[PDB]
Each structure stands twice: as C-alpha cells, then as structure tokens.
C-alpha cells in the first residue's frame with residue numbers, strides 16, 4: 358500500500374478500535390483515546406508503525422504503562438508516520454491493546470466544522486467526517502489502508518442538545534458523567550471494515566422512518582423533503598439483496614448533510630451520507646442511492662486492497678446500481694444510463710488527455726494524492742469493462758451469477774485486480790476461450806478510452822441526440838422553430854442527456870443559448886444535474902447573465918462534481934475570471950478542506 362506509512366498487514370493487523378472521544382466545538386478538536394487491538398503477523402515483533410496526519414499525541418499506553426513512540430517528518434498528504442516501541446516482543450498471532458491519547462487539528466483534512474450560520478437551523482454548529490480515501494489518519498492514528506479490516510466500538514461526548522451518529526449500530530446514550538452539559542453516544546460496528554469506512558456526524562439532527570430498516574437523518578428543515586425523495590430505499594435494498602445476497606449490516610440509514618458535503622454519497626456502513634443536492638422534489642437523482650446501497654456488497658464486503666484497485670469498488674457498484682435502475686424502470690433505461698456513462702468517460706479522457714496515467718483503469722498511486730487522481734474513470738471505465746464482459750459471456754442473467762458468486766467468494770476480504778481476474782477465469786472456466794479474446798493489458802493498464810465499445814440500446818437516447826443536433830446545426834434563421842413543445846416527451850433524464858450531448862460540443866453561439874433560455878426557460882429548473890450542465894453551457898458559450906447564477910451554485914453547495922468545474926469554467930471566461938478567484942478567496946476559509954485545496958489548485962492560487 359503505497360498511500361500508507363503504517364506497518365503492512367504482513368507485519369501486524371488491527372482487529373478492533375475502541376474510540377472514546379469528545380467533540381469540542383470551541384476549539385474545533387476531537388480529543389480522546391483510540392485503543393487498537395493489534396495482532397502480530399510475525400515472530401519477535403518489537404516495533405509497529407501507524408499512519409497519522411496533523412495529530413497531537415499526548416501519550417501511548419500498553420499494559421497500564423507509558424511507552425516510547427516517535428513521529429517521523431511529514432510526507433505531505435500522507436502525513437507523519439508514528440513508530441511505537443512495544444514493551445514486550447510479540448509472537449506470531451499474539452494480540453495486544455495499544456491505547457493512544459490524541460487530539461485532532463482544526464485543519465484535519467477528514468473533517469469539516471460548521472458555524473451555526475452554515476447550517477439550516479442557524480442555532481447550532483455541526484461536524485462531519487469524510488475518511489475516504491486516506492483521511493482516517495487525520496482523525497486517529499491507524500493503519501490507514503483498506504488492506505486491513507477491523508471492528509470498532511465508540512463513545513462520543515457532545516453538547517447535550519446535539520446528536521452524534523456513526524457508521525455503526527446505535528448502542529444507547531447517557532449524560533456525560535464528567536460534564537452535565539454533555540451526552541455520551543455509544544456505537545458498535547460488529548462487521549469488520551476497512552478504516553476508510555469510519556464516519557461521524559454531530560449536529561442538531563432529527564430522524565423520520567421511511568422503511569422497515571431505514572430512518573432518514575438531517576436537520577429539522579430537510580427531513581420532510583428527504584423522506585419523500587428517498588422513499589424507494591427499501592425497495593432498492595430488496596432488489597440489491599436479490600442481486601448480491603443478504604444485507605449483513607443490520608440497518609440502512611441515510612444522513613442528509615449540509616450542502617458542503619463534497620460527494621454525491623459516501624457508503625458509510627449502516628449510515629450512508631448523501632448530498633442535499635439529491636433533493637430534486639421528484640426522486641430523479643435516486644441512481645445515487647442505488648449506488649450507495651450497492652456498496653454494501655461491492656467495496657464494503659469485498660474491498661479494494663489498495664487504492665490502485667479502486668475500480669473494483671466503483672466498477673462493480675455502478676454495474677449493480679444500473680441493474681437496480683434496470684429492474685425498477687426497465688432494460689432500455691439501464692442501456693440509457695450505461696451509454697450516458699460512456700459519454701461521461703469521453704469527457705474525463707478528453708479533460709485529462711488520452712495518454713494521462715489517471716485514465717488507466719488500474720493506476721499507480723505512488724506519490725499521488727488520491728484526491729488529485731479522483732474522477733469518473735474508475736467508475737465508467739470499470740463499468741464499461743463489466744458491461745463488455747456481460748455481452749461477451751452471454752448476458753445480464755449470466756454475468757449476475759458471477760457477480761453474486763464473486764461477492765460470496767471475497768466477502769470480508771480485501772482484493773487486487775488479479776484476485777478479481779483469477780476468480781473471473783475460474784467461474785467462467787468453460788469460457789476461457791472467450792475470455793482470452795479480451796485485450797487485458799489494454800483494458801487494465803493502457804490510458805485512454807477502452808479499446809472496444811459495448812453495444813447499447815439507443816431507444817431512449819435518440820430523441821436527445823436528435824434535439825441536440827438540431828441546436829448545433831441550426832443557423833440564425835432556424836432559431837425561430839425551437840419551441841417549448843420540443844421538451845414535451847422528455848423525462849428529466851433525457852433533458853439532462855440533451856444538455857450533456859450539447860455541452861460536449863460547447864461553445865455554441867450566444868444567440869442559440871439566449872434562444873434556448875427564451876423557449877425552454879432552463880433558468881427555472883432546480884434539478885441540480887440539469888442546472889449544472891445548463892450553467893456550464895451558458896458560461897462556455899460566453900453568456901454574461903449566467904455569471905452570477907453560476908457563482909451562486911458554485912458556492913451555495915459544494916458537491917465537487919459541480920463546484921469544481923463551475924469554478925474552472927468561470928475562471929476560463931475572461932469576464933468572470935476575476936470574480937471567480939475573488940469569490941474563491943472569500944469563501945476558502947469556510948469550505949471543506951479537500952474541496953478548498955482542489956479548487957485552489959484548479960484555479961492556480
């Protein structure tokens with residue numbers, strides 16, 4: 358694991374974390390102890406190395422006594438390695454508890470601390486974590502690699518008027534014995550997990566039940582809207598269970614976060630985190646819930662061994678997500694989303710350049726901050742491979758037998774791309790000859806678009822392409838013929854694909870874009886996917902009226918998918934360039950630390 362500084366799993370393995378901590382909003386720190394139950398994997402183990410990032414270590418205690426440890430020099434985004442001297446050499450398989458008293462930094466890359474005014478209520482502050490990929494080390498010292506799986510319990514002291522939740526089953530609350538203004542919330546995760554899956558939120562939260570095993574959590578003002586948007590959750594879970602096997606995590610809860618949450622979703626076990634930008638009014642961005650749910654098998658049960666193999670998490674999840682959406686809405690809809698996905702892949706490979714190392718399916722993250730390498734490639738190129746293999750091996754029903762068996766095979770383990778491919782060869786051993794016509798070295802290791810494009814039903818996509826081509830081939834004297842009735846028989850999804858198609862050939866003349874707004878009133882659409890593509894199109898086609906609208910969306914929410922390219926587009930447009938950097942600098946302090954960093958690089962500030 359080249360993104361980690363800790364002792365690898367071949368040396369020692371954490372089996373358990375007991376986390377006792379207190380959330381202090383006055384200092385914006387979390388303080389407490391992390392007791393790691395560690396098992397030696399080798400004879401005569403005398404030292405052990407842990408990942409940390411911007412942590413302040415008070416002490417380290419084993420068998421009731423303080424021991425020697427030292428902090429290495431910082432290695433940029435990887436943080437600083439912590440070497441602990443064991444008081445007694447350990448034999449193979451021996452286990453000890455190591456108790457580390459620590460404090461986080463207010464600058465922790467895993468954390469965003471929000472003032473009361475940054476929340477919906479305006480009365481209380483809020484805190485959330487985001488550990489994927491390598492941010493867990495910025496909360497607590499650990500072996501910060503997905504190659505190692507541990508269970509955990511935690512006890513979290515917070516101001517009594519707030520709620521704490523984690524990626525675990527709730528196990529009771531009580532007043533803090535050491536401070537009656539505080540509550541302690543207790544948590545147990547009985548299923549071994551990689552530590553990137555550890556999560557915490559503290560805020561003024563309420564819950565409403567929406568299925569036999571799902572509560573929605575968010576601030577008071579978002580609850581009602583959230584319970585409607587996500588009401589299909591149980592029925593998606595049921596489908597995912599038929600596809601991948603039993604849901605083993607107990608509860609499937611949903612937290613709807615303040616708008617600066619950086620991602621569409623994070624598949625935290627027992628408690629998926631989502632962006633409030635999913636709240637369209639009409640359930641249309643639900644693909645994202647199906648994605649999150651699907652991770653309960655692909656990534657949370659079978660996990661990538663290192664981040665070079667992330668495509669295993671994401672490809673299989675997008676594969677299952679799309680099947681779910683195909684069961685609910687039909688096979689032609691699965692093909693629509695898949696083809697859209699391919700178009701997202703063209704964009705990413707155009708953006709990076711077709712020989713860019715990050716357009717490889719398997720990458721080498723040696724000396725690369727995973728947050729800099731992150732994009733749609735592992736999602737859409739990985740999904741593209743699996744879709745290709747599906748058509749090649751005899752269809753969806755057959756490839757789903759493999760996906761289910763693949764989940765049973767590698768449950769509770771961490772794997773590499775070769776583990777995946779060896780299993781693929783074993784399961785289809787009667788089709789080894791078909792398997793060998795695949796160009797493995799290209800699909801897995803070459804940059805750029807994959808070397809073969811699957812087949813796609815075009816039924817639902819045609820009308821989108823048709824209308825997009827009308828706009829692009831149109832001259833001045835054709836603009837009159839565009840009319841609101843053009844949108845008549847398009848779902849929001851087809852409207853989104855319409856724009857996506859059009860965005861790919863941007864810029865268009867300004868007169869076209871003005872006419873589009875004249876007749877389709879896209880300025881009124883609140884659907885965040887559609888609005889995003891629309892503002893992008895307007896900004897790249899140089900419409901100055903779009904400037905305030907795009908600055909507002911870029912900053913009112915902070916989903917990296919939207920905020921990063923809106924800022925880029927704004928910076929590349931001479932008229933908005935200066936407000937773009939200006940707005941970034943005035944918002945920078947109150948941004949998610951990871952979003953802030955990446956936007957800052959994107960703008961060269």
Ligand SMILES: O=C(c1ccncc1)c1ccc(OCCN2CCCC2)cc1
Nearest residue numbers: 489490620622623664667727728730731
């Ligand atoms: O390891 C990667 C990676 C990036 C590109 N190509 C291959 C691998 C990686 C980078 C960043 C990362 O961050 C996680 C942020 N999330 C949370 C929710 C969706 C993604 C996770 C994995």
Ligand SMILES: [Yb+3]
Nearest residue numbers: 400401447448
């Ligand atoms: Yb020995």
Ligand SMILES: [Zn+2]
Nearest residue numbers: 648670671674
């Ligand atoms: Zn994912």
